[PDB]
Amino acid sequence: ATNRDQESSGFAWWAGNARLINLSGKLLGAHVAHAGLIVFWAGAMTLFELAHFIPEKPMYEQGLILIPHIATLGWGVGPGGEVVDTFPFFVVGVVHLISSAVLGFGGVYHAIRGPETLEEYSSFFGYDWKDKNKMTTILGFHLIVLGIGALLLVAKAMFFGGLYDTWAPGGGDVRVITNPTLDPRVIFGYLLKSPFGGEGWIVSVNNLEDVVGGHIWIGLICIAGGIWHILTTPFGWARRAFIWSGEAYLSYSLGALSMMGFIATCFVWFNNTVYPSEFYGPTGPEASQAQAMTFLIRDQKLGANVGSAQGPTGLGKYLMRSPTGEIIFGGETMRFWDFRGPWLEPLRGPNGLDLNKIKNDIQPWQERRAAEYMTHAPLGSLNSVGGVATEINSVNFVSPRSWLATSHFVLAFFFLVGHLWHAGRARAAAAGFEKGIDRESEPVLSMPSLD
Amino acid sequence: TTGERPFSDIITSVRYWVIHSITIPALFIAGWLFVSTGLAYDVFGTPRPDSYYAQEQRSIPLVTDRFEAKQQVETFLEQLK
Amino acid sequence: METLKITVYIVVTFFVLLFVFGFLSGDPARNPKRKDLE
Amino acid sequence: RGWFDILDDWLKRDRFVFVGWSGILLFPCAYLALGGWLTGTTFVTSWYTHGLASSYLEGCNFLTVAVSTPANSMGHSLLLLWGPEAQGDFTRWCQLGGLWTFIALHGAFGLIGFMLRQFEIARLVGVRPYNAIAFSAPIAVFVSVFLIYPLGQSSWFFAPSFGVAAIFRFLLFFQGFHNWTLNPFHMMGVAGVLGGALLCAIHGATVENTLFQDGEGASTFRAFNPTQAEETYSMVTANRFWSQIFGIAFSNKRWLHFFMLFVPVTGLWMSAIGVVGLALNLRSYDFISQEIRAAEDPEFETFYTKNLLLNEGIRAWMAPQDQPHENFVFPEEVLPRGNAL
Amino acid sequence: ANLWERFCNWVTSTDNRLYVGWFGVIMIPTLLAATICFVIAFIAAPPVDIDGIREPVSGSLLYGNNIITGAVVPSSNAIGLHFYPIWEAASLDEWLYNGGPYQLIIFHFLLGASCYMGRQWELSYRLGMRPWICVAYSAPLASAFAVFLIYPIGQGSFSDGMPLGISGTFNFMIVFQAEHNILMHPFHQLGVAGVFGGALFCAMHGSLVTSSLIRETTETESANYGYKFGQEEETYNIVAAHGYFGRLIFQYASFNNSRSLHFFLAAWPVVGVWFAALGISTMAFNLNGFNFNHSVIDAKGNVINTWADIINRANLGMEVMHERNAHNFPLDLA
Amino acid sequence: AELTPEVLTVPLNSEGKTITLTEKQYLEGKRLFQYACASCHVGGITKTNPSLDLRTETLALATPPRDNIEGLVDYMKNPTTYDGEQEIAEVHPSLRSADIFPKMRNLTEKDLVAIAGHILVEPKILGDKWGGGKVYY
Ligand code: CLA
Ligand code: CLA
Ligand code: CLA
Ligand code: CLA
Ligand code: CLA
Ligand code: CLA
Ligand SMILES: CC1=C(/C=C/C(C)=C/C=C/C(C)=C/C=C/C=C(C)/C=C/C=C(C)/C=C/C2=C(C)CCCC2(C)C)C(C)(C)CCC1
Ligand SMILES: CC1=C(/C=C/C(C)=C/C=C/C(C)=C/C=C/C=C(C)/C=C/C=C(C)/C=C/C2=C(C)CCCC2(C)C)C(C)(C)CCC1
């Protein structure tokens, strides 16, 4: 039983997987088996959601997070995001579940049956962490794989049905993308936008052309980069900047994933293009705006002139100006004037909300949508009591946006912590004092006093 | 050590489990029945779901007199017909 | 305000550059024990 | 070597659970406080004292069960089972809140018992009794909050009830009615608790990160021997690190650990003094200069006046259900409310 | 050596009275700017329209505040999450009315404290130390992020971020309870276990070590003089302290391993506070405390109040009174 | 106190006829009301127009009367403004507008009766809480 106790390995049971660092075969096993866990949950969770799914209820009233992902890809839904066929959901679930058996098979094999190290078995599959060439090669392989994935999204969008477009003219619908955005000024344009209000960095992408073109770019970039890293080896400056060891690489990736986690938190919280509100429920900004819209409509029906109605503070009760002058909804929702949504934009003119359009052009479907979104705001308790914290039990509801955002903030945080942990440790181990200070060679004792 | 038998010894011994595979379920069932027979309600004076209010009453039976409190509660209970 | 903005932009860029180039300047080697970490 | 000394012998035998003379006070009182809390939260109502459900039997969960205080009409009655109120009737006694005084009093004597235990074992083992001394802060908190505070008020009713949500209510009541956050004694309490937490964290982490390599393991816990004579971490390195990071550093270990005793203990004692004041409604509720200015000047606004508006809300909206003995009926039209909400 | 090499050697020097380092290169100016702006504002800033309703709140000393009431007031609700640096204002007077100082201060501070954490890693590396003190520091830091950045992002405005002042902090807490029932949230409860527990173990450790100090002094001098800085011998008898505590409870509830014990001392409050931060950071997206309002019902259907419902009444008072002129519609949706 | 046949006896129509609901009907009523209505009408109020509540007195002064089973079933088929003057199926869930309010598609006549019965019985249980809003929480 090689390296399977503290004495031989140096690692206690609670750090047991650290015993795998230089056992590439077993480590392979751990990784493949874990991939199997991921795929397993995707499939099983999908089948669970589908069993618990009532087609004529909004997805977001049913605690669904995966079916919305499938539906966004254009599978199983029609105009307005109405479910017209569940079978694609069923397929996604079943095929993932079946695939997890394969992955788990390979993982268990490599983990407790196969060659514990791969280097004597195969020079192709074996590796040394310190071998910069091989490391960048495997990195290359996987970059090519990722690019291929992004290109699969592109292919879905352009050649196999299209995507769900909440912005489609005449109403949200599945649409084939025929003219993806290829101009780098726009694509990287997003990358150089401020993350602050009214800008929102990449989180602000608001049309499917930009999304598809983005994935075209990312796909080519990843494939090119992958080839590049297969054919090259780190340059001198890189060599001198980094720690080259398993734990170091792990730490780099932990940093990356923490970053991605925070980004996804903001994506699901603000964006309603790749997270359509039809499936995920309205955003916080969206529901606040929707309340304003709802009472503007009600009161104006009762005969109120909403353009001239002065509220208690002196600001408009229904309508006011943004700090740069655009006409926007009044009350606290003044904070959310950067919100943009298919049900509100027809009332928007060049200077913002248009009073004539507001007076004459509001359709019943808009009233409906604003009422729906206002009454499904992403607020709710841990035991899934919908509404403000003072609300009485009655409505079983917490928004998918809340679930997704909170879960991924938590994970991104602990992953930042993990990055600090493993980076600090990788530095200490590479320098050789990760186990403590050498009593006979205590560095501070050879330093001059501070005073 | 302080002279007692190690817990590791005891709880992994056959005899321990011969004893406690009887005594633990016995206790569990006893408590179960303490609730299911309704005895708990009567021992502790806790209202059953139908004994918080009389049918058309909506006023809490709050105790308002220190020394005749006992009689107050008794009257309150009679008020459930 | 424009002079203020330009000034701050130049300052921030200066310090950021110091940070990056500094950590690029053989930092793993800047420890008491094993210096050869390239 | 007479009966007293034989008894002393037996009480002080080195067994799995040490007994001691102090054990005679401690174990029955601690056992009855814990058992009383569990009995009450499992089976006992608060219908007749508060108009509340408070047990598992009634449908409450871990967060919402409590052994609730007695009716306000009970005043500060000891509420003994054989007393003039319950008159020996166990069921009525439960319905009147007898378990509350039962738990508070047996709890108080159990705490005396435990601190006596700390003195006794310290004397027996030959150490200084600084652990007992430190435990005086828990005593001060329990006595000021569960005994002195309600004794200053109308009745045991306004003591904290023994339950999670019940305690949360106690907190919110103290904000609304006492403006307790404004109180400099509570603030010193906060500084002592948060500062205690900080010292706990920073000391533990510092020791763990200035360890000497005393073994070959990458898991470093085994490289310690309780019998060893050497420091297991470097105080000199620790001192240089914090000196260069924070400007100042401990250099004396004895002082370090005394300070760790001093900060949270002192914090809790100060908070106790504040609650003793709240027993008499002797609050730090207002700043008089603030109020004179704001009364005369309808444009003057600070976070202090904002928070009093919040307090006024808490009082008006919580009082009728929280204080049922008062029979409050606040018509809709008199409830303080901002626009729309 | 060239000028840049010399400069690097100085920056990363282990002999500076205060360590600079590359993180320090960012930390020092940002903390200085945050500090200076904070002090000037706290003394002299005019009233700030925090809630964007032209109702300016006075935070500074010169404008009617004391130490307890004063604050640097969060930026206007009108600004929301927009970036509002000095050069976005038409004038310093506009900047001040809209709460520019708040944004300048909290951004410079969040950056500076992040770099403080990094700097803790950096010096641990220069001194040949193990690296994880910075991880302990990540807990208070995460908390700061939670109340100054994450909660504002989630609610769509820096006007709902914590005020830089004592009473303002209490304001933040009370409105938080109204809108999230944070008290009934298990992550806040883990936070309380974290700091109550941290305090407890602080006092406990302190008292145990102090109680087992080895006699090295006379009764007319402080026992502290019995320890000398850098002595190799431990200054207390851990076997005696363990004998004591182990008898106080029972033997196997006590730590005989000092490393294990100090690791506990670090882990408990750090993890607890991590959960406090995550509690704020997730109520930032309105996943709130447990709601057991009207959860117990009798046979007819009458509501039987629990302590949770009383809590709910208090929260209602807070809700209906807070920001009394800012709401025009019945639901407070952020 | 109990959920008695008398509590569950509610006006069938405007002409003084009653109908006694079963306990299964009461439970179905609460379930269906939560399913199709509570998102706006939780506790007997109306979130998107708080001026109109589901109190029995309010429903009695509605046009046509809505304080009986027939009136409520009709409302769920063809909802009107309070004065009976406008049909509002286009902005209010109804069988007539099941196409745009899809949760109404699987509601049967039996379901409508149960929802109606819930709306009538619940104030008999909760009193002023029903339609009361936060003041009465
Ligand atoms: C996703 C989580 C995960 C994965 C994939 C692994 C994987 C691994 N661990 Mg780690 N570990 C984990 C979590 C995980 N661990 C956790 C949570 C802890 C703390 C409890 C540890 C503590 C730990 C220690 C202390 C050690 C390991 C070791 C190992 C390796 C060898 C295991 C072995 O030989 O046991 C043999 C086990 C058996 C013979 C029992 C059967 C195990 C199989 C895998 C069960 C498969 C069940 C599955 C349903 C079968 C499906 C079949 C179907 C597809 C046909 C292996 C690569 C060891 C190592 O590093 O060796 C060098 C080692 O010493 N682990
Ligand atoms: C891809 C992500 C990743 C990978 C591959 C690793 C890998 C490793 N970590 Mg790292 N780590 C990570 C992320 C990761 N970590 C994150 C996100 C954190 C922040 C918490 C850490 C913090 C951390 C510390 C402090 C340490 C490691 C250590 C290690 C090494 C041993 C781990 C082990 O055997 O644990 C065995 C597994 C366990 C003991 C199980 C832990 C139980 C968790 C906490 C329960 C989580 C609750 C769950 C999510 C929900 C409840 C479920 C329940 C109800 C059933 C191994 C190289 C050790 C090391 O330094 O080795 C060099 C070590 O001391 N990691
Ligand atoms: C990305 C993660 C994620 C998200 C956002 C969701 C979201 C949801 N799930 Mg899903 N699910 C997940 C992963 C996730 N799940 C996993 C891993 C499983 C397998 C256990 C499931 C299995 C599952 C089932 C069977 C069901 C759901 C349901 C739901 C819905 C209700 C959730 C609820 O009430 O939670 C309750 C909240 C909790 C239990 C709190 C969890 C708090 C954790 C333990 C804290 C962990 C902190 C950290 C990780 C620990 C680190 C330790 C530290 C020291 C380092 C909601 C949409 C329900 C639904 O409506 O389906 C239609 C439902 O029935 N989920
Ligand atoms: C994913 C990571 C991964 C890696 C790096 C390896 C690597 C290895 N495996 Mg393992 N294995 C894996 C996954 C992996 N396997 C899985 C998923 C299973 C279950 C089927 C197994 C079951 C398995 C067994 C039973 C054996 C190995 C063996 C080997 C060794 C010989 C490889 C060879 O020469 O094949 C030659 C390569 C080919 C014939 C080409 C493969 C064509 C592929 C599969 C087409 C599909 C490609 C596509 C990208 C798949 C995407 C999947 C993704 C969507 C999840 C090599 C070290 C052997 C060994 O260890 O001997 C001592 C061995 O006996 N593997
Ligand atoms: C998984 C993705 C991945 C990873 C881990 C790597 C890793 C690496 N790359 Mg590779 N690369 C990749 C994908 C990847 N690459 C792709 C897709 C391409 C095609 C575009 C390339 C093209 C490429 C080239 C041409 C080179 C590398 C090189 C390297 C090596 C050093 C790079 C470095 O120091 O980064 C650290 C990053 C920097 C030092 C950049 C400057 C620092 C600034 C301040 C970063 C600020 C970014 C900011 C925080 C991000 C916010 C958003 C932003 C848009 C505003 C390292 C092994 C170098 C090498 O040694 O090749 C052999 C090299 O010359 N890569
Ligand atoms: C040493 C452990 C201990 C201590 C300090 C206490 C203390 C208390 N108990 Mg608890 N109790 C205990 C163990 C203890 N109990 C045990 C083991 C049981 C299980 C039987 C109980 C069961 C119990 C119940 C059911 C109740 C209490 C109550 C009380 C409180 C009132 C007691 C009282 O007034 O006594 C008065 C008696 C003395 C102080 C004895 C002194 C005797 C003197 C010194 C000698 C002279 C006696 C004389 C010769 C007798 C002549 C009698 C003649 C006139 C007829 C007090 C806080 C009451 C309470 O909490 O109400 C809220 C209550 O109802 N206890
Ligand atoms: C290594 C290791 C580990 C881990 C492991 C793992 C992680 C594994 C995994 C594994 C896996 C991952 C597995 C999986 C499997 C799967 C399966 C086996 C499946 C099956 C399926 C089926 C059979 C289906 C069915 C169906 C259909 C088809 C239709 C629909 C419905 C149903 C569902 C019925 C541990 C930690 C223990 C430790 C030791 C070492
Ligand atoms: C898909 C898509 C898109 C696109 C995207 C893109 C195109 C992206 C890109 C991106 C990118 C392009 C990214 C990048 C990043 C980078 C990073 C993240 C970096 C990092 C770095 C580092 C980390 C470094 C560090 C350091 C320093 C600083 C100093 C020295 C040392 C060292 C090296 C350590 C859009 C939006 C249009 C739309 C949607 C879809």
Ligand SMILES: CC1=C(/C=C/C(C)=C/C=C/C(C)=C/C=C/C=C(C)/C=C/C=C(C)/C=C/C2=C(C)CCCC2(C)C)C(C)(C)CCC1
């Ligand atoms: C009051 C009174 C008394 C006393 C009594 C007693 C002493 C009792 C006891 C009682 C008891 C002594 C009871 C107990 C109970 C217990 C229980 C009920 C438990 C439960 C548990 C659980 C539920 C668990 C949980 C958990 C945790 C804690 C953590 C881990 C995880 C888990 C979740 C598992 C006398 C007669 C003198 C007189 C009259 C008055």
Ligand SMILES: CCCCCCCCCCCCO[C@@H]1O[C@H](CO)[C@@H](O[C@H]2O[C@H](CO)[C@@H](O)[C@H](O)[C@H]2O)[C@H](O)[C@H]1O
């Ligand atoms: C916007 C961010 C900027 C991105 C810039 C990306 C640049 C990528 C290539 C960086 C080149 C690195 O170049 C780096 O700097 C100087 C160049 O004299 C060197 O100079 C350093 O050498 C040694 C290394 O031990 C140090 O002790 C010494 O203090 C210093 O002179 C570094 O060893 C070199 O690796």
Ligand SMILES: [Ca+2]
């Ligand atoms: Ca290569």
Ligand SMILES: [Cl-]
């Ligand atoms: Cl307020």
Ligand SMILES: [Cl-]
């Ligand atoms: Cl509003």
Ligand SMILES: [Cl-]
């Ligand atoms: Cl009315």
Ligand SMILES: [Fe+2]
């Ligand atoms: Fe210590």
